[PDB]
């Protein structure tokens with residue numbers, strides 16, 4: 055039931071103990087903490103306590119991922135949330151792609167979360183249903199506008215894992231109205247992976263009175279590492295300070 059392969063260089067989780075306000079950062083499907091690290095480091099430098107976990111079956115080998123279910127990915131996030139609760143009075147959650155899905159999921163099950171920052175979060179990806187063949191699909195290159203960036207992601211995607219994601223997304227979509235905390239929803243106009251309309255499914259679905267969509271015009275899907283990174287960091291910091299206890 056445990057991972058059989060070692061953690062890849064660059065895929066290590068990140069923890070920083072600072073003040074009583076904490077931020078949980080969640081990476082995406084087939085990705086690793088690498089996707090979120092620049093944000094995590096910026097938030098720690100600003101005085102936040104920070105938790106950037108490595109999702110089970112991620113950052114090792116796609117064969118480990120194939121052996122996980124979405125419950126394992128939820129468990130990794132719950133564990134990180136729990137780490138923060140032991141240290142913080144105020145907790146924010148942010149995440150990219152499926153990390154954004156998991157951000158929404160955690161807020162749907164924990165009303166104490168003080169605010170969320172989903173980034174190109176996924177609750178409906180029609181491409182999965184369309185395709186739903188081989189045991190592993192060749193991964194397409196990382197969707198970044200800046201070609202110089204090196205993202206860390208599995209070279210193959212187990213198709214069985216796509217079914218797990220679809221289940222997680224379906225459950226998350228169904229429960230959106232449980233979210234009442236403030237929300238800052240980032241979306242890349244030119245996301246070629248997660249259809250940008252997901253931003254509006256989320257905006258309309260949640261019950262929050264304080265919510266907004268910020269469109270990113272200079273990034274593709276992996277916006278946390280792309281040209282609009284500085285803006286994501288700056289606006290996220292403003293959001294944390296505004297809503298912190």
Ligand SMILES: *[P@](=O)(CCCN=[N+]=[N-])OCCCCCCCCCCCC
Nearest residue numbers: 082083084151152153181182185186247
């Ligand atoms: P995010 O967590 C990360 C996207 C970048 N990495 N990748 N992969 O979104 C995960 C879901 C992406 C959409 C998957 C569509 C696959 C369609 C293939 C159809 C085969 C049945």
